[PDB]
Design goal:
Keywords (chain E): Cytoplasm, Exosome
Organism (chain E): Methanothermobacter thermautotrophicus (strain ATCC 29096 / DSM 1053 / JCM 10044 / NBRC 100330 / Delta H) (Methanobacterium thermoautotrophicum)
Largest sheet of chain B: 6 strands, mixed
Strand order of the largest sheet of chain A: 1-2-3-5-4
CATH class of chain A: Alpha Beta
Shape of chain A: globular
Oligomer: heterohexamer
Strand content of chain B: 35-45%
Family (chain E): Belongs to the RNase PH family. Rrp42 subfamily.
Radius of gyration of chain B: 20 Å
Largest interface: A-E, 31 and 35 residues
Shape of chain B: elongated
Helix content of chain A: 25-40%
CATH topology of chain B: Ribosomal Protein S5, domain 2
Subcellular location (chain E): Cytoplasm
Structural class of chain A: alpha+beta
CATH architecture of chain B: 2-Layer Sandwich
Number of helices of chain B: 5
Subunit structure (chain E): Component of the archaeal exosome complex. Forms a hexameric ring-like arrangement composed of 3 Rrp41-Rrp42 heterodimers. The hexameric ring associates with a trimer of Rrp4 and/or Csl4 subunits.
Radius of gyration of chain A: 16 Å
Helix content of chain B: 25-40%
Order of helices and strands of chain A: EEEEHEHEEEEH
Chain lengths: ~210, ~260, ~220, ~250, ~260, ~220
């Protein structure tokens, strides 16, 4: 039993809703544990993908002065790269697509949650896609490899391995690792994360159908 | 050219609106509090489709050199690219700054919060309230939605007791306290279209208005904030008429806020 | 009921306005109102150097209200602050109705308002001086724009609030109008006014505008 | 061009100079200088802060200039560009290197508290030669400056608003700027001349005829003779500027 | 470019290199005399200078006992015509954070020993990466140079006398290093992963992966980059070579410092 | 008639090293070592984008280039040096072969020990030539100054510590045309004339090192 009482391969409460915003071309709202994430898609408009991951000042324990920081800039960079393989961009020449990811509340694993919600927003905008993109983090905490690390589990985590994939082919579209893993431990955490992605993918597809 | 501006004008001059409401009628209002669990106070307001989330984040620091006995309020708004295709990213533009200052004016001038009670040590340590307005969706009338959400969030705010011991500032998170709220104030925004002022304008109406006026009224029917906007003029009658309506609407909005909480 | 400096309730501070004082600017004005010392420069109409700010139908008033670092008691770090940004926004809006713009498609009129010394009521003073600078530049105008603040201090609704009177002051009501049509072009209020008190202050401010307008016309006439 | 100039001036003559002090009532020292039509307002704003780590016994001077869009259509808004920065530093150099102000006497507590003089140059109108106008106005404002007495009582600083004291001014320095046009150097260039000059040179001279600041500008070269000629004229002209100033202040 | 890629699906590379072969590596330390530690690394023509500048300041409120590391990199207009001036862009920030991750997560430096006075005063190590020339693979060159610079670092002894800090430059001490860790970056081209990509290869890669391995063969940092995907096999293959190749890089480093 | 601590005469430069072509990416480049000074220059262009063929120059210092870590980013001193360096270089270039384009001159100070602005120009001119920019002459720079009540050339660090005047000069060697000139501290017109002439002599000596660096093409 983990600190919140989960199993080693157990996700946090997840719900995904599509089409919640009025102005955006496509949109999604994602709740994952404490995480509250809103995504808006604009375009294609006057093909590149332009992604801003941003956190609300009140999204964390201590008020985060608004404006971009180094961590936000990195996440924005790798998210744009994470989403790109899913989109059939050849249809819209010399234009741009905007993906605005707003973290309203954060509780660890937002970069993955962000991508997961973004893919839904992208589909909701009617962007031609060859597949969904779905992301999830695995990691290590009690000397044990576990799936979907919570915020305060990461407070004393031994490794964190965020992964984003294209469900159908299992193409790894995002991948990071910090902390300390043996090549054997890593192999498990990647595989465990990939399983989470496939499970979360069902919630993505259902949000679109609903 | 200029067809929409004539179409929407003729309609309002003959006393009707595109979405079919009275000239002095708000859209549907939706108010939730305690939306962001980490935030000490928070709210989500929907006014039509215009959606704003506000968080209140208390913090301890230096008071201003010439108000050593007062706590601090800091109002800032993020007009997100999310909320509209005309919203540029980057630090707050003209439009954000105005919205922000007008909300700050309404909260501040109504003396809604007793900053004196936010003092901890005079001339050194006081409570700083970061009011952060997060514009999520823009479909007309940011001001009324903003003031409503900020007021709501302030009412929702609970902060730890700050005791003074030895000279340092002890935070006591066992005794959670509401903010010292002395009174409430809310805001009505009107748009001059044709020869008429219309209350709570839609995006369609904001596109074509001659001018706008926002009025902040208090519980006891006094004016604590006013802001003419737009590139066209208002007449004396337009202004005084807007006051008149605002003063009879705000008490309605005030009991709607109280009931939603 | 005397005010601190001796003024009656409906009395303006000393005013002084001169046109054409700058060499480089297309039009200019210098305004002295109590402690206030305000300089305005107008440039244009000219081609838009910034890609964004253009309109196919008419020209745009770009306005910058700026304070000198030494314009106030405590050195103000130069650069734009929130208050300056708001004033610039509503000034550009305050001046716009006076100007016959449809004259100059795809182009810019720059209005640079420089506060060398501040003593309350600068946003109004700024607009008042700007209108003179605009006319001095030969910008075709249908009317002047003139501004003045009223407010409340000793439980009394009074005219043209001094910076001192801004501290203990119970309310502030800046107004800018087009003199001929009396059309309100700027309007704000803070503090605490009853609808009845507000009506008084609006009307009192409007009277001040008409009085100040004579000083505007006399400056340009010279 | 060869003998005389477009406005009737000869090669080594300034335009009509106008100097006012005490112009901004709130400011501790202030000045308005007009050199031809080139107009600069300077304010001196004293403040209490920490001294620089290497100099815990010295006061601080901070020079900044605002080249206002007001002052010229070629002046962009926003933070100080190249042109402003240079002007600003060259003025700072002249005031600093002349040792005009005894920074040692602006100490209040050594190591922690000293007087910080914000010299703020406000360029209102630009019709040629910012440097000479700027140095003149800054020097003028510094002489006009009166600051409160700062006493030390057991620990931190106490300001007495009733003993307004002057700045401790050891000496004075001023500046001449020359423009190379054709084969000639011309003192105090107009806008028309600044547009076409090959190069320019600014020279800061002190009361006792020594050089405290020099700045070659422009895209073209100067000769050894041009430089030494400018030095000789600067040395000659500056005592007359210094005297002209002193007279404007009585 | 069509002929660079078809040439990679056979195990041949443009400059004659083996698929899993680093370019020539050149490591110098003590390059900037004023700097407390410094290094110049050349990996092929990719050149990075790193300086380590110790400074005394407050620790992070929640870790009063921890010394501070601050990693920043300057991707210089000098180093490439695609490098814009101004504050660090995306590309700089990523490089910088990835290097910081490798140094931090390997727990290479005992930050606890950088504490001078708990809660108030601690050693702050400014790691500054100065990209001088860019001809492919900033990450491996950067990590290598930072590690090298860190080993080269000597700092004054900080004594606590009666409660105030005192800096005795008499006795210059090395940094408390627990271990070393280094990085291998691979580029997916065609169906192959290629170790240490050249500029020519970076132009055309599908994706890239950087792996930071420690002395004892454990993974401390990983970073997938690029617009294309990787497969599970690609990732695990890359790990295998990194684990294999890092000890060699460490051997190579230790020898260059003697 | 007085010897300096390090053994140099009043009119003596410290050993100077210039090397051309050291960078791969840059169109032209140079590395300069002068005392403690380590300076790298990169030239890019002429390249695309409007009244003239302007040359854009950025003088920058590495955070580790000086005793106390200098926060990266531009400062007033760097902005001034960049301004006058662009002006210093300009007369040497025959920009009239391509009268609308820009030339990027990136001067990176890796280590500083006084007199960098001059060194920076000196290395720059070599980088410019190395890029194949058509030039009518070289540009070379050197500082003189005054320290022990004695005007001297190429100020040492211990000297700069105590210095009484700095006089950076940059010239076009062939014509002796002055292209940069500054002065601070306190000089008599007679002292200055000595300072300037002494600096010019240094320029001519340093010019030989410039020309020799290019011969190794």
């Amino acid at each position: 039993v983990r600190e919140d009482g989960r199993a080693f391969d157990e996700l946090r409460p997840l719900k995904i809703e599509a089409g919640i915003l009025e102005r955006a071309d496509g949109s999604s709202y994602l709740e994952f544990g404490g995480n509250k994430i809103l995504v808006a898609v604009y375009g294609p408009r006057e093909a590149v993908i332009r992604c801003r991951y941003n956190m609300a000042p009140f999204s964390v324990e201590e008020r985060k002065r608004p404006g971009p920081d180094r961590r936000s800039v990195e996440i924005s960079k790798i998210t744009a790269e994470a989403l790109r393989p899913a989109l059939i961009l050849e249809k819209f020449p010399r234009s741009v697509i905007d993906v605005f990811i707003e973290v309203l509340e954060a509780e660890g694993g937002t970069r993955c949650a962000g991508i997961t919600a973004a893919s839904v927003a992208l589909a909701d905008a009617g962007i031609p896609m060859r597949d969904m993109v779905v992301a999830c983090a695995a990691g290590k905490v009690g000397d044990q490899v576990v799936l979907d690390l919570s915020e305060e589990e990461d407070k004393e985590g031994q490794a964190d391995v965020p992964v984003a994939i294209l469900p159908r082919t299992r193409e790894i579209t995002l991948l990071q690792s910090d902390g300390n893993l043996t090549p054997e431990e890593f192999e498990r955490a990647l595989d465990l994360a990939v399983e989470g992605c496939l499970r979360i993918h069902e919630v993505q597809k259902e949000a679109l159908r609903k | 050219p200029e067809i929409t501006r004539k179409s929407i004008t003729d309609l309002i001059n003959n006393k009707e609106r595109i979405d079919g409401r009275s000239l002095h009628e708000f859209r549907d209002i939706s108010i939730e509090t305690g939306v962001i669990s980490k935030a000490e106070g928070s709210s989500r307001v929907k006014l039509g489709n215009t959606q704003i989330i506000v968080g209140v984040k208390p913090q301890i620091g230096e008071p201003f050199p010439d108000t050593p006995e007062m706590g601090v309020i800091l109002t800032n708004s993020e007009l997100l690219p999310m909320a509209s295709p005309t919203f540029e990213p980057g630090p707050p533009d003209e439009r954000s700054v105005e919205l922000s200052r007008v909300v700050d004016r309404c909260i501040r001038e109504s003396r809604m919060i007793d900053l004196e009670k936010l003092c901890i040590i005079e001339g050194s340590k006081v409570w700083m309230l970061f009011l952060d307005l997060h514009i999520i969706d823009y479909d007309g009338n940011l001001f009324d939605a903003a003031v409503l959400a900020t007021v709501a969030a302030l009412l929702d705010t609970r902060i730890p007791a700050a005791e003074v011991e030895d000279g340092e500032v002890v935070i006591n998170r066992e005794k959670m306290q509401p903010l010292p709220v002395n009174r409430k104030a809310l805001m009505c925004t009107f748009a001059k279209i044709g020869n008429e002022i219309v209350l709570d304008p839609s995006l369609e109406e904001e596109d074509i208005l001659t001018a706008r006026i926002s009025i902040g009224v208090t519980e006891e029917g006094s004016i604590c904030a006013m802001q003419k906007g737009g590139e066209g003029p208002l007449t004396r009658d337009d202004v005084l008429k807007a006051v008149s309506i605002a003063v009879e609407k705000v008490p309605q909005l005030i009991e709607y806020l109280d009931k939603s909480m």
